[PDB]
């Protein structure tokens, strides 16, 4: 009676409405609009600091909300809280398993997440009493490697995993409150909205999904890329986000009238993007690459406004402070640079 | 403004207590020689063994310490998390080597070696390759139950190399089969040369007592070719 091939045919009818709905609202392109504004000019940054001390390659970093401290996680099995004004060190924390793939700094400055190929997120209470740092909760529910994690407050943390699921956790009870399903491919990154009611997530199918944190569903689905997505980040006002992927492109998507708006590509670039990030105003866009460079694009004109070329191996991570004063990059040569 | 100079000197001594522990941690990271053990799954850790996600077993040969990691509880999409293992010394690859009756488990092992060897980030990592699970009569040519001329259309037109060392008493046509499977590898190895890594084959059996020695004697060759390349000699 053939149930499978008419359910697979109804989805073709349902998808052709969504493509024709987005086509009906495409009254102009973005480069038709912004072709009258003045350019940004060439920019340059000069590597104000350099932070040495890791034994193996660096996979992640995260600034603090006070724009001074930062975390860094490396495959030798360490986790360092640097101070960026004076290049000192606080709290080199040793890990239980060495393959860590992500880290996060809580907005209260009280905890530090990490996780990796051991399928476990860890909490590491910093502002402690009667002792040094210690692991606190050790969340464990996933069946694949842990690829990202971000704090909401000191009791909720949303994690991304390699078993195609996102999840929302409850510290001090340990089990997960909400479990997000729907991807087909390893979820590689995430980013929260500035009001923290929603978050986006891109995976190894060429797709990105908007999720409701409080509800537990998926609102929209964005498909314009061609390979695995490795990075994502929101715009400052929260009404847009930009992705980076293996097809040497970055793209800009708006939430309302779900389609893409801009594509950041160049003919000399044949390498994949490992990180994206925005400036404070949202005019620049800073992407790391696999050919050891770090370009800078104009988010309203799709031009290229500069380059940052200081590392020896590929750039894994990237991040701009909340006041917008500096950019930190990290790479597989185990050094971090601060550019300004 | 000397009120700044109170606590930042305590910050300054908090920097030197950290650096003293990192000196003790560099000394044991620099002398531990990580290895990654991956196979098709059937042989696995039956051979490479000294008598949750990552499993972590360590051992010691000649007062030199090692690490071996078997990957478990992960999915079968390997294009990520395989590039977390690029600064290891070697990748111990285990092949069942008796795949004629369960499928074609032998051809699937060849496609995986072609993806690992040519990857991008694994271009500098040498592979120690064990051809496990001999079974010279059972499911092989000493009994003639299954034919390898039908699974590979060659090997009916192939002869044994000039210098093949048999065991005294070993079947003249099982040594023709044992060296053909090894020669399906080493032509994926000896084609591309821009990576500068190697491939080292071996034959393991049921009695593999010496099998921590052949991995010791060849991780010594891997470090030797790294230091010789520093002087532009290779």
């Amino acid at each position, epitope marked *: 009676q053939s149930e499978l091939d008419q359910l*697979r045919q109804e989805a073709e009818q349902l*998808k052709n409405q969504i493509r024709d709905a987005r086509k009906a609202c495409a009254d102009a392109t973005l480069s038709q609009i912004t072709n009258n504004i003045d350019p940004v000019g060439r920019i340059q940054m000069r590597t104000r600091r350099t932070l040495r001390g890791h034994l193996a390659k660096i996979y992640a970093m995260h600034w603090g909300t006070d724009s001074r401290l930062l975390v860094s996680a490396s495959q030798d099995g360490k986790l360092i809280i640097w101070d960026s004004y004076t290049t000192n060190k606080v709290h080199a924390i040793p890990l239980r398993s060495s393959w860590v793939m992500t880290c996060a700094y809580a907005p209260s400055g009280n905890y530090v997440a990490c996780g990796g190929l051991d399928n476990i997120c860890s909490i590491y209470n910093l502002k402690t009493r009667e002792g040094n740092v210690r692991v606190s909760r050790e969340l464990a529910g996933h069946t694949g490697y842990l690829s990202c994690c971000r704090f909401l407050d000191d009791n909720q943390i949303v994690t991304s995993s390699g078993d195609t699921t996102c999840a929302l956790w409850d510290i001090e009870t340990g089990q997960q409150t909400t479990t997000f399903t729907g991807h*087909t*491919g390893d979820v590689m990154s995430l980013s929260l909205a500035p009001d923290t009611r929603l978050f986006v997530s891109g995976a*190894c*199918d*060429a797709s990105a999904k908007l999720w409701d944190v409080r509800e537990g569903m998926c609102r929209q689905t964005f*498909t314009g890329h*061609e*390979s*695995d997505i490795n990075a994502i980040c929101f715009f400052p006002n929260g009404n847009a986000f930009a992705t980076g992927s*293996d*097809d*040497a492109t970055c793209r800009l998507f708006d939430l309302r009238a779900d389609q893409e708006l801009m594509t950041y590509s160049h003919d000399n670039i*044949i390498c*994949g993007i490992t990180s994206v990030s925005f400036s404070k105003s949202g005019r620049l866009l800073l992407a790391g690459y696999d050919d050891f460079n770090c370009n800078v694009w104009d988010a309203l004109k799709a031009d290229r406004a500069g380059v940052l070329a200081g590392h020896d191996n590929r750039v894994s991570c990237l991040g701009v402070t909340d006041d917008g004063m500096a950019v930190a990059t990290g790479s597989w040569d185990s050094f971090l640079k601060i550019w300004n | 403004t000397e009120d700044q100079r109170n606590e930042e000197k305590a910050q300054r001594e908090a920097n030197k207590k950290i650096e003293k522990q990192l000196q003790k941690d560099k000394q044991v990271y620099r002398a531990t020689h990580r290895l990654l053990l991956l196979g098709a799954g059937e042989s696995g850790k039956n051979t490479i063994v000294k008598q949750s996600g990552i499993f972590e077993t360590k051992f010691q040969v000649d007062k030199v310490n090692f690490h071996m990691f078997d990957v478990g509880a992960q999915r*079968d*999409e*390997r*294009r990520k998390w*395989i590039q977390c293992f690029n600064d290891v010394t070697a990748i111990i690859f285990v092949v069942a080597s008796s795949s004629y009756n369960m*499928t*074609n488990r032998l*051809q*699937a092992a060849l*496609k995986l070696f*072609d*993806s*690992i060897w*040519n*990857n*991008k980030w694994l271009r500098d990592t040498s592979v120690i390759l064990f051809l496990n699970k001999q079974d010279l009569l059972a499911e092989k040519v000493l009994a003639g139950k299954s034919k390898i001329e*039908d*699974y*590979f*259309p*060659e090997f009916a037109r192939y002869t044994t190399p000039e210098d093949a060392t048999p065991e005294p008493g070993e079947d003249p046509r099982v040594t023709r089969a044992k060296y053909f499977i090894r020669d399906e590898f080493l032509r994926i190895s000896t084609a591309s040369g821009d990576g500068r890594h190697y491939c080292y084959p071996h034959f393991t059996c049921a009695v593999d007592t010496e099998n921590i020695r052949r991995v010791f004697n060849d991780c010594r060759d891997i470090i030797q070719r790294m230091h010789l390349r520093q002087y532009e000699l290779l």
Partner: nanobody, 128 residues
Framework: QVQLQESGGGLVQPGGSLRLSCAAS????????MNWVRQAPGKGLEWVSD????????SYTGSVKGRFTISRDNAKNTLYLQMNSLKPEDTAVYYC?????????????????????RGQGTQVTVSS
């Protein structure tokens, strides 16, 4: 939306012939190298052939070595597979899979269950 729609497969007598096809859309066809995989009932997915970027660098498996042939046409985003002298071992559904990244020579997750860049497949049957 990356999509790959195979067509042109059905039942035939042994010793006969059949030519499959695939129309690819959603990406630049010239940068990726393609594959063909199959799944006999009760076994699992296995690899059949591949072909590089516009190249005459073609690989086959040992079972269908002397009688199968592949061909791509980059001008129309199409991938073919001409099959001849079919045997009852060739009773499987055949998918068209591409490599995950452009301009590469490794190709990892083709013969994997739950793989993204792969069609739904076409049935090919032989019977006497």
């Amino acid at each position: 939306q990356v999509q790959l729609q195979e067509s042109g497969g059905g039942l035939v007598q042994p010793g006969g012939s059949l030519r499959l096809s695939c129309a690819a859309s959603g990406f630049t066809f010239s940068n990726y190298k393609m594959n063909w995989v199959r799944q006999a009932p009760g076994k699992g997915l296995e690899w059949v052939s591949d072909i590089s970027q516009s190249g005459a660098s073609i690989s086959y498996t040992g079972s269908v070595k002397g009688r199968f042939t592949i061909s791509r046409d980059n001008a129309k985003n199409t991938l073919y597979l001409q099959m001849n002298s079919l045997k009852p071992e060739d009773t499987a559904v055949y998918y068209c899979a591409r490599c995950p990244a452009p301009f590469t020579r490794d190709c990892f997750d083709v013969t994997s269950t739950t793989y993204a860049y792969r069609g739904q497949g076409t049935q090919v049957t032989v019977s006497s």
